[PDB]
Structure 1
Amino acid sequence: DEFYISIETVGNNIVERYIDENGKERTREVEYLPTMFRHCKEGKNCAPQKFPSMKDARDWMKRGMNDFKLAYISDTYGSEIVYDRKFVRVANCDIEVTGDKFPDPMKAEYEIDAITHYDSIDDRFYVFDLLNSMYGSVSKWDAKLAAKLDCEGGDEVPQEILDRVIYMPFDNERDMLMEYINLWEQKRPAIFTGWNIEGFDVPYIMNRVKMILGERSMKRFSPIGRVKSKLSKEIYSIDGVSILDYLDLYKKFAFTNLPSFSLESVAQHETKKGKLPYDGPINKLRETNHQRYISYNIIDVESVQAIDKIRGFIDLVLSMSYYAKMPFSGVMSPIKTWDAIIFNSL
């Protein structure tokens, strides 16, 4: 009851997102000067220390921004934090890109044709189906068929999954993308997961939007209007939203030693449920069986929430974060966490 969701900074100012004292998520840009600093931030670290004066903090601020954020939090939430996950919007997507070669996210040359995106608040799987684009036009996915047995041409996607589905077919990619940005705008995720979203999905979505709708549209993913490409790889950061890959969480917090950390292997290992095999060039399954294509896509996206349901990692990130009184992204490393404990301790 009164806790932060995001701590960003713009113009030497703090822009924070939080769930207020009546459960509504609000954002505020504060004018803020920290009261401590750590000289080494201007395997070693150093003890923090209080500024003597508001003049000191002031020319420091003009000279670790992360320590600035750590301080804000401490000043703003000095008491034990009381939080409620029901107030935190965790979303996770999984896209499908049909093309020759392979969908190199950096290049982002093929039209993405499927994006299912769960939302913990609504508890709905917003499915985005592109039935019309370069690799042939295709028919609308069918929820009723999707439920039927494989023997009867059904996909066998369970009902409560199918029941929370919110099908949205599109005539063209521009439109689908343009509407996906909208989903982000009106339902902005505090934490965004998935499985290798950081490696594939996120960058490929940013790169295709950017390439198709152009930069300006791409930054609309960020409520700060800040979406950057970091560099083999390219990962993309979306300010205002903690992008936390469940493949990373799973590898950091679930003692496994699996030969493959594929969605399938992990999901099969965790939920014990699996996906119907498919005798046919999977690389061409949208062409051969788009109905199945869309169901596989929605199964994948629920696998994550299932695994999370079993493992409770999103919950740990929140406990760990609110306790250390640090941004969710630190939980992902001893050093980051330890480094915040060092500062927040004094």
Structure 2
Amino acid sequence: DEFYISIETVGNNIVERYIDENGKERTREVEYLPTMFRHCKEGKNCAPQKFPSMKDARDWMKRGMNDFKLAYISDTYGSEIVYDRKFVRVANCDIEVTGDKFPDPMKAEYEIDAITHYDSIDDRFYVFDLLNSMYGSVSKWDAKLAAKLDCEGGDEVPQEILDRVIYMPFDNERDMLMEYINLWEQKRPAIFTGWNIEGFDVPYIMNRVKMILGERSMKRFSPIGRVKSKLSKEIYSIDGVSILDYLDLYKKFAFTNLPSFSLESVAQHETKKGKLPYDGPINKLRETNHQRYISYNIIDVESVQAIDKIRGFIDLVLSMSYYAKMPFSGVMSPIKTWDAIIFNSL
């Protein structure tokens, strides 16, 4: 019954994505005036002061900004925050790219062959397939073929996953990227997860759409209008959407001493189910066996959700966040958590 999902500050305004009483996502931008402040934000922190009147507060405005957000939350949300995840749009994605090994995401030279994107709300795996990626043109994926045992020419993708798939073929990357951007537009994720999304997936999709669809298409992702990056691996920031890499969440809260943290290693360890063995080379897979390629893409995207159903690290994230009355990204930072508590303790 009313809780935040995103808290942004554009101008001296607070753009906030939320979920009101009737479990529906909405948006209400507000020109907010902070109650408290911390002199030291002009280990080590400081006591939050309290403006007795909106007068001395206004006399203080403009003369970091995260206290603004924290102030907004504490003010607009007083008392126990109660939430239900069913209205929180959690989406993860795993993209596929064929080309010279480790297609550097900063350069983004090669096309994207596939993009499965699960969306927790409608519980569907949207599969984007470019059966025309420069390296070749290949056949449509067989939702009926990918099931029948390997005693045949199929990959044993469980029926459950397949029932939830929505396949979408494209003969050119450009037309494919155009649709993906359209899906985020149609269904803006609250939290965007994956396994190494921060390292590969995200930067790649960005630098790509940039290099192709140009800067303006890339900003379609951020609801408020802009995507930044720290740039040698560079990382992207889609304002309005919390990007929480599951690999990081796993290393931080799983407490498992595994010799490897590849998705296959963790998935096999957690879910026990594996993925059908290879068959010859590796990268050539798309041409030397498309269809299995795509089935793999979806399988990988499901395993993240599978690990989560066991671990519940997305639950933890919301729980810590709403209890400390802070933005989603703060849960992985002891400092940012402590800092949230100091401010909200008043």
Q: Same fold (TM over 0.5)?
A: yes
1:63 Cα deviation after fit = 2.0
Once the two structures are overlaid, the 10-residue window that deviates more, 256-265 or 91-100, is 256-265
SS in 2 for 1:144: coil
1:268, 1:212 → 2: CA distance? 37
SS in 1 for 2:235: coil
Deviation sequence 1:21-74 (CA, Å, 0-9, x none): 111100111010100111111131111111233233224331221110001011
Contact 2:128 2:170 in 1 (8 A): yes
Deviation sequence 1:88-119 (CA, Å, 0-9, x none): 00000000100114211111111011100000
Once the two structures are overlaid, the 10-residue window that deviates more, 323-332 or 226-235, is 226-235
1:194 aligns with 2:178: no
Contact 2:4 2:19 in 1 (8 A): yes
SS in 1 for 2:177: helix
Contact 2:94 2:301 in 1 (8 A): yes
SS in 2 for 1:288: coil
Deviation sequence 1:281-314 (CA, Å, 0-9, x none): 1111001011100000000000000000000000
Structure with the higher fraction of residues in helix conformation: 1
2:124, 2:232 → 1: CA distance? 35
Contact 1:103 1:109 in 2 (8 A): yes
2:237, 2:49 → 1: CA distance? 30
Once the two structures are overlaid, the 10-residue window that deviates more, 219-228 or 96-105, is 96-105
Contact 1:91 1:118 in 2 (8 A): yes
Contact 1:92 1:118 in 2 (8 A): yes
Contact 2:101 2:283 in 1 (8 A): no
1:55, 1:211 → 2: CA distance? 48
2:59, 2:294 → 1: CA distance? 55
1:192 Cα deviation after fit = 0.5
Once the two structures are overlaid, the 10-residue window that deviates more, 76-85 or 53-62, is 53-62
Contact 1:185 1:220 in 2 (8 A): yes
Contact 1:93 1:116 in 2 (8 A): yes
Contact 1:12 1:61 in 2 (8 A): no
SS in 2 for 1:236: strand
Equivalent position of 2:93 in the other structure: 93
Once the two structures are overlaid, the 10-residue window that deviates more, 295-304 or 327-336, is 327-336
Once the two structures are overlaid, the 10-residue window that deviates more, 166-175 or 99-108, is 99-108
1:229, 1:326 → 2: CA distance? 23
Equivalent position of 1:331 in the other structure: 331
1:232 Cα deviation after fit = 1.5
Equivalent position of 2:204 in the other structure: 204
2:275, 2:78 → 1: CA distance? 48
SS in 2 for 1:290: coil
1:133 aligns with 2:133: yes
1:30 aligns with 2:30: yes
Once the two structures are overlaid, the 10-residue window that deviates more, 99-108 or 55-64, is 55-64
Deviation sequence 1:107-158 (CA, Å, 0-9, x none): 1111011100000001000000000120100100011100111120111100
SS in 2 for 1:206: helix
Deviation sequence 1:189-209 (CA, Å, 0-9, x none): 010000000000000001101
1:146, 1:55 → 2: CA distance? 66
Equivalent position of 1:219 in the other structure: 219
Once the two structures are overlaid, the 10-residue window that deviates more, 57-66 or 240-249, is 57-66
Deviation sequence 1:144-188 (CA, Å, 0-9, x none): 100111120111100010100000000100010000001100100
1:60, 1:98 → 2: CA distance? 54
Contact 2:147 2:154 in 1 (8 A): yes
SS in 1 for 2:136: coil
Equivalent position of 2:123 in the other structure: 123
2:58, 2:65 → 1: CA distance? 13
1:58, 1:290 → 2: CA distance? 62
Q: Percent identity?
A: 100
SS in 2 for 1:112: coil
1:6 aligns with 2:6: yes
Once the two structures are overlaid, the 10-residue window that deviates more, 271-280 or 90-99, is 271-280
Contact 1:41 1:64 in 2 (8 A): yes
2:87, 2:56 → 1: CA distance? 38
1:299, 1:128 → 2: CA distance? 14
Q: How many residues end up aligned between the 2 structures?
A: 346
1:257, 1:34 → 2: CA distance? 45
Once the two structures are overlaid, the 10-residue window that deviates more, 178-187 or 42-51, is 42-51
2:339, 2:246 → 1: CA distance? 23
Q: Which runs of 5+ in 2 are unaligned?
A: none
1:210 Cα deviation after fit = 0.7
Equivalent position of 1:340 in the other structure: 340
SS in 2 for 1:153: coil
1:57, 1:282 → 2: CA distance? 62
1:226 Cα deviation after fit = 1.4
1:230 Cα deviation after fit = 1.2
1:229 Cα deviation after fit = 1.2
Equivalent position of 2:258 in the other structure: 258
1:288, 1:302 → 2: CA distance? 24
SS in 2 for 1:145: coil
- Give the TM-score taking structure 1 as reference length: 0.98
